[PDB]
Symmetry: D3
Subunit: 244 residues, 6 copies
């Protein structure tokens, strides 16, 4: 990918919503990760997010290079810790876990990795990351107070705060594997209060899931690959397009 990811997002958003496929480099081998990314490409995905866990970094470079040499959509780093920086990716979500109670996850980890992000000249997309009930594993490991599903005003406050600090992307995270995706009323309130790129993920499995999320205001929909894959992504992209 030559183009800037952030410019590429704005290009897509003039006409439709963005889908991103999340891959954990630990869950498979680089070659297996390529066949997953390729199946998602055939399904209609717009990019690969790489990371999600806290784990060894050498598998990341291996997975990222195998991706960079075999696909033509951006590879975006979604770091679960400072280990999550690799050269073969096209951008990084440079994120702050806003509702952690631990300074390490809010500010400290990203301070440790900042020079390395600069050294590699990787495009850094400034992002507020907000864990919503139930929160999954990231909500537990990252010491969060998950935002309750019936308190959308709390989510809107953090999104406005993130916008005021300069973050141009905002991510409502229910947690990978959550039984229910982030509520529409919360997605819609956040979208109303901010002019950021709004990313929603966690528990989006069906096309009807993706349509509700997209219809509520999500600019970007993130899903994993648990199911068949090409088919899952295609249905998700269909629901995403089913909205106005």
């Amino acid at each position: 990918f030559k183009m800037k990811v952030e410019d590429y997002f704005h290009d897509i958003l003039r006409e439709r919503k963005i889908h991103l496929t999340l891959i954990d480099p630990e869950e498979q081998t680089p070659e297996e990760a390529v066949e997953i990314a390729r199946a998602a490409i055939r399904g209609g995905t717009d990019g690969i997010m790489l990371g999600g866990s806290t784990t060894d970094s050498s598998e990341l470079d291996n997975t990222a290079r195998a991706l960079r040499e075999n696909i033509d959509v951006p590879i975006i780093l979604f770091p679960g810790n400072t280990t999550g920086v690799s050269r073969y990716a096209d951008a990084i979500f440079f994120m702050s876990l806003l509702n952690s109670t631990n300074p390490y996850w809010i500010i400290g980890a990203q301070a440790l990795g900042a020079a390395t992000v600069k050294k590699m000249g990787i495009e850094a997309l400034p992002m507020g990351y907000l864990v919503v009930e139930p929160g999954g594993t990231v909500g537990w490991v990252g010491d969060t107070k998950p935002v309750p599903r019936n308190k959308p005003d709390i989510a809107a406050a953090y999104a406005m705060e993130a916008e005021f600090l300069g973050m141009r992307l905002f991510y409502l995270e229910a947690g990978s594997g959550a039984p229910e995706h982030v509520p529409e009323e919360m997605i819609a309130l956040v979208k109303r209060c901010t002019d950021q790129i709004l990313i929603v993920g966690g528990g989006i499995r069906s096309g009807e899931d993706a349509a509700r999320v997209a219809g509520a205001g999500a600019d970007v929909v993130v899903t994993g690959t648990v199911v068949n894959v090409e088919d899952k992504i295609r249905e998700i992209v269909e629901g995403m397009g089913s909205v106005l």
Copy 2:
């Protein structure tokens, strides 16, 4: 009062010279004495009035912000010590995260509580990374910080680069009001080359030669309290370099 965006105002000045701001704590005097300091400091050549610095009564902030808005014409910038530091009468607010606090409240929690009020008042929000440097003053104690050691400039550079990556366009090296010595020139200089943000430096700046080294080191903005036309030599000092 101030019509233009304080941030474009900043860039206009920076095309020729460096910026000086006067910090005024609303509690150390009545509103009308603060207009004294404000106008006197404007005569000294300051480019704006920073209001706040401590945790204060908010109705006092409103009265000093009003008194200033009715009488001076340099921008009035809120430098909030807590959510108590938002007032309708100011031109802008340093919307800041205390980056090296160990308490989530000072890093991110306080600002989430105030965000809706900032949006409601529609006050211009300047996104700022705020970094406390040894000794750190009262703000370093109350804000539960680990003040950056003065002989660890690489640490300051890492946080400056992180703030810029998070989208913060201002960065504030804070030695603390009343610090015996200002922020090291080596730190200011290393931060400046790592980031393309507006570098603000404050704390322990008294003399005109304090000004000269801070500004010469790389500061875009110099902040000083009061001790009265002790401002032109800081300005003087800043001048040149």
Copy 3:
């Protein structure tokens, strides 16, 4: 004194009956709307207006406090969700520690930062231990609490005894504004047996029967919001039924 101390006012009422207070959040309506809420609650029998909540502008607090005090003769008590919660125009302030927060700022730090303003303004400070009970509402989340489990009354009692030992004369069991169910009767009663302080219960008290159960279990003060006069009258009569 022309106006008595709010803490004395409380003890006078507690000589014959239990106290009801009406919580008004200044950010949920306009000052004049707030006045009509208060006047209705006073017609319904409320003994005071508590003013505050998480998410609060100091400008709106002052405007609401000023409007209330022009128009009513019962006390106006600050129930601060942050340091922005202090206003010249109130009669008293619940000077409270959020006992079961995991964040020192809500336990002690916020109160240190405003102690000087409270002393400058000379507003009556009522020393209170504030304890968030499951589910805990928005204050429980913003204040970084570990809400006391509804089935662990011994925990609430330990905090009540400790707050008394530290010299706090009032103790507040907070289920959170809008909780589906008020603090359990068993917990209210056990706290009441373990301490001699004024016991305030709030959160999820909507009906006269809610108020009867909470008052009957031992609350000295019942606190309720205004989501629906009338509602207040039924609550106040519910509390009386227990005498």
Copy 4:
């Protein structure tokens, strides 16, 4: 000691100031502690504080044991953890470590021990406990941010807060073994801002120390043989 320790304290302060001798039950045997106790009483100390660090409570109980039926000055628990409560003392400084960053030392340890204090019927004196630099071992173990010596305003703010929360005693602690006692202007300022009993302790060695600390506002002086003389005598500067 039949009377309430707090009443006792107020009687003393109608004429003079108060001295308390701190004994750590881990530094000596129970009968060795009674020896130090008597010497300081002969020396004019007003009471024995019993605690200072986290130690086995059987150590504490037995040191409180001998002490009770040998002396007639009060025994006051100065707990460093929940281990610090014994049926033997006349009173306990029921304290919150105000400038800890850890909730356990602000509020959590006292909640765990409250039911026990209430069962033993011990008189509990509500105290705000504030650590001043350098702060010593307690400042380090209690995860504190010690109040800088050149920031008396910070200490005054916590004193006002403690009073507002209903704490009737306030302890300015430099840390056992501190090179310098708490700064006079800090003591002066906090005494100006509160009507509580002001206890100061830590690094008060000579009669000059106890004089200067008492002259600055301190109502109670805490020190760790008959060296109490110049302390108590020094506290003669009224």
Copy 5:
């Protein structure tokens, strides 16, 4: 030695079968009522008495520990809830870190404050990682924990491996006294698959069915309380045998 080390005693039993331990809170009864409970539990087949589980004064602890030691021949193991929980009358102490507390005091600070005491007393110290599982009980609340979600066995296995790599030879999955449901079988089995530590499971184990499921899933040691005695313990012990 006349008396085995408790850790060697555990390994001796484990060559043939699983270990049952009876948890007794000293604050819940008088010392001689505790003797009645403990002797019943021994008749039921328990292998030892754990003593503690609350934060309570050290004087009730010593009295209970003394009375137990006069009357029983199985080890008394301290299961401390704070530094108050150390007593010279026990045979050993679970020297534990609360791995998933967010408060350093419960991870490491409290154990630092009591270590000198443990050394001066003679107490054998069994090194243990203590991991609170949803719902967690009173200990999960007091100890500032983030209880491991029942559907997150991978998290529990990561802390088990970490404790093993740090030198802890015992690992305790704690659902909390009075938990409606015991620690999930899936979590137990994954933890057993990943570590060679002595694996202890407690909380909400009330029937022989519970115990057979917990033991069958891989627990080396089953802990149960006294709420209904000789019968419950026998039922639990026979379940474990199955």
Copy 6:
């Protein structure tokens, strides 16, 4: 490459003499360079290479780790400044807990996240208690520590005994890379009197006389970032 468990190798050395480890920050040079610093280190008499102390990128390690391993025959030991410090090309890892951090992430959290990887890689894990002494350096700042004060050796000895009781067989007194002065001799000695762990001391060890006094006070292992003089100093 190694073979032989690093822990046994340490014990074999300590039957005769004290151990020296050479600390290499892989971020402050290139893999081919790091080899030269290492080869020069061993001809100075050092017993192994500690790889990390940072505060780093992890492609730099895996490549310095390989470069060190295929050139050298002393143990390569990871000294992780974060989870970023796990590389399969090393012989062992100081699997450590930052005992006097106020942050649970540095006490226990970070190590839980990397434990599965350490198991997968079969890297020898040495259980270690890591205790920052004032001034504490960069690790003591980043790791949110309350550094042990130099005049409070009882504090360090309390944590030494606690870590022994928890099963950590190595205890590391860290004054910080670049510290002006090394851990107080009274502190090293009191720690040695209180546990039976391998006692490691690092930070602020410059001269042969530096390495003579820390090893003299009780240290089993001496770490330094020259080495010839360090090693002869350690005898004593």
